[PDB]
Design a protein around this ligand. Structure first.
Ligand SMILES: CNC(=O)c1ccc2c(c1)nc(-c1ccccn1)n2[C@@H]1CCC[C@H](NC(=O)c2ccc(Br)s2)C1
Ligand SMILES: CNC(=O)c1ccc2c(c1)nc(-c1ccccn1)n2[C@@H]1CCC[C@H](NC(=O)c2ccc(Br)s2)C1
Ligand SMILES: *Cc1c(COP(=O)(O)O)cnc(C)c1O
Ligand SMILES: *Cc1c(COP(=O)(O)O)cnc(C)c1O
Ligand SMILES: [Cl-]
Ligand SMILES: [Cl-]
Lengths: 359, 358
């Protein structure tokens, strides 16, 4: 069974936060969704003032990382209408994460409505400046007051919101440099890298500091003896090139266990497939193929995809000691600009689309 | 710079709870709490047991900036309470902290604080055969920020649980293991060698799969040669006559996918000290185990950890095929010897530098 949006309880706040220089993830809206689960099943969902959590010191969320999260954006169009981008995919992914951690199942459409209801309550937090959005952070945590390692008998689902600025505030895509060092592993086949679980991120903090120490902005996560490019930072990685077989192609790593199935990533594949102008494939990509392709001037554009930026160009990769220039910016970046344009059009209501869910 | 035990703020409880055991559900009256931030560590405080108040954006809950430890205090016949090799836990906790970019601290200061805490709740430490006080330190990040970055805030706390005897009737009872290579606990280059919360959540579903398949625990296999790495949340040992005809005690080496257990190390030390057979840290593969079993060379297989000290293994389900492991048939002599000596040391029957008095 599941909590129902029909049973939503609303507690409006009596201490409205002073509304706003928006740094991602540091500013929170006035309300939050909160739903508890125990042996009686799910409690009633409530929207309530933004407040601290009270947790037992033995809560399984804090000892054995019984935790998962989601990340999606709500967009305010020119028509002043707020919409969520392909939220159904986030709910699908959230439910898969929950099952992987033996956390309680819920109804994806019910949570979607509760989230819709929450954003409606806090709709005046949704900025409308170009490229801005409201970031939605649903979380599901185990909350058993017990040091045993087992399926929890209690859990907490909550959602908080953050207004965020344009990822490219200059009003144009700015490329990033990547550290590609095979010493670091994000995830492995047989692991849980393909689920959006807190456990996958904690260990990356030190690696990201190492990228900074070596003059890079983000980490290119390599995997295997053959140095497969899997993801970049917290984003999916795409390469637009002419492959060894002479075919112009957009490639991204396949969903074989080490890749988080990004909503933007799936959207880019869907869009590109639909245009039908070039080959679009899911295949592994090795550092050896990339080096060769750069030597032969076959690489046009490399970029990350994710809710944060939508698509972010890469201009450099430090692989061991070798500094590799990636000619993304010298090639438009045509495909990147085309993706941003079409996504912006869809997201901000410029052109009505099944991918958008009205608040 | 670390917090100091000298600065301890004691706040005794207003209303003490009545004493009694399922592991990890009963807690004592007090807990240690220390806060960290841009001004460094606050002052440590032993305060009554109580809830944590966390910002809903806490990095402990979003990005698993969390680590823990697990160790036991034992109350001997002289009613003195002793911790088993706590310095090793402190060493391991600090390594974990550094791996997650959480604040460094002084190992001796934290141990003294834990000692002070246990002293305050000394009467919670049970003394019946096989019982102990379980000590659970935790360090968590606590940034009120969704950025994935080094936290500028953190929380170190320690809670305590009295626990019963791991074995019913004071007698080792063996377990069955599921050995399925599809499930991978940790990878070379990963963080399996640190005691981070993120390593445990993913195992919950795998343990359920184990139960569904008639087994009690998971045997964690690694690599294309199906190396035996760990069993459940414990290290794994094999006592056998090796391919070269020599009697040996073997356990996988600390190559990155193995958690360096305190009991594990103590079993190696103890067996090395007896100098009666070969003690070695070497990779163990399923192929080697199968051939050894077929040739009658395996005497005992067991796990080691703070939970039970040593736990015999009598069956492994591998590739839809049940392998009988003749551990109980062989005494289990080594297991029993290890348990007895650990027990004598732990409950003070024999003096030993491994024990830290409270
Ligand atoms: C307006 N800004 C946002 O909407 C935003 C910004 C950052 C977000 C954000 C939203 N959401 C997240 C986030 C955090 C954890 C998991 C998933 N997403 N993050 C991560 C924070 C830490 C850095 C990380 N950046 C990268 O991985 C890369 C930059 C360039 C390349 Br190529 S990769 C993004
Ligand atoms: C009296 N009991 C205890 O002191 C006790 C019991 C269990 C403990 C316990 C104390 N402390 C922990 C624990 C939990 C997480 C990390 C480390 N230890 N655990 C784990 C709980 C989940 C099951 C796990 N068991 C195993 O892995 C195996 C049993 C037999 C073999 Br062979 S393997 C132990
Ligand atoms: C969330 C996430 C993605 C995909 O992001 P979307 O916003 O769903 O496109 C990719 N990789 C990692 C590591 C992530 O955490
Ligand atoms: C804690 C732990 C060990 C070692 O336990 P000790 O009690 O330190 O001997 C081994 N393996 C795993 C997976 C653990 O969590
Ligand atoms: Cl969709
Ligand atoms: Cl020691």
């Amino acid at each position: 069974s599941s909590f129902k949006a029909a049973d939503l309880q609303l507690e409006m706040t009596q201490k409205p936060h002073k509304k706003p220089p928006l740094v991602f993830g540091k500013t929170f809206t006035d309300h939050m969704l909160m739903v508890e689960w125990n042996d009686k099943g799910w409690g009633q969902p409530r929207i309530q003032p933004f407040q601290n959590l009270t947790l037992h010191p033995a809560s399984s969320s804090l000892h054995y990382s019984l935790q998962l999260f989601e990340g999606m954006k709500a967009f305010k169009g020119k028509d002043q209408q707020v919409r969520l981008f392909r939220p159904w995919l986030n709910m699908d992914r959230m439910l898969r994460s929950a099952m992987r951690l033996c956390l309680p199942s819920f109804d994806k459409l019910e949570l979607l409505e509760c989230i819709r209801r929450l954003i409606e309550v806090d709709k005046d937090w949704v900025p409308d400046a170009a490229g801005t959005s409201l970031y939605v952070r649903p979380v599901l945590i185990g909350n058993e007051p017990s040091l045993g390692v087992s399926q929890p008998t209690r859990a907490l689902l909550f959602v908080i919101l953050c207004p965020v600025g344009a990822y490219f505030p200059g009003g144009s895509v700015t490329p990033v440099s990547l550290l590609a060092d095979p010493a670091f592993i994000r995830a492995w086949v047989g692991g849980v890298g393909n689920y959006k679980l807190g456990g996958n991120y904690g260990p990356t903090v030190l690696v990201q500091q190492e990228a900074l120490k070596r003059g890079c902005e983000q980490v290119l996560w390599l995997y295997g003896p053959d140095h497969q490019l899997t993801e970049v930072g917290t984003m999916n990685i795409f390469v637009y090139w002419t492959h060894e077989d002479g075919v112009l192609e957009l490639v991204t790593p396949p969903l074989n266990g080490v890749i988080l199935p990004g909503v933007v990533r799936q959207s880019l594949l869907d869009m590109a497939q639909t245009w039908g102008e070039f080959r679009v494939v899911e295949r592994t990509i090795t550092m050896k193929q990339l080096l060769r392709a750069l030597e032969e001037g076959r690489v046009r554009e490399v970029f990350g995809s994710g809710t944060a930026c939508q698509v972010c160009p890469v201009h450099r990769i430090l692989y061991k000691d070798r500094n590799l220039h990636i000619p993304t910016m010298e090639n438009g970046p045509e495909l990147i600009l085309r993706f941003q344009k079409e996504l912006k059009e869809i997201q901000y209501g410029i052109r009505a689309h099944e991918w958008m869910f009205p608040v």
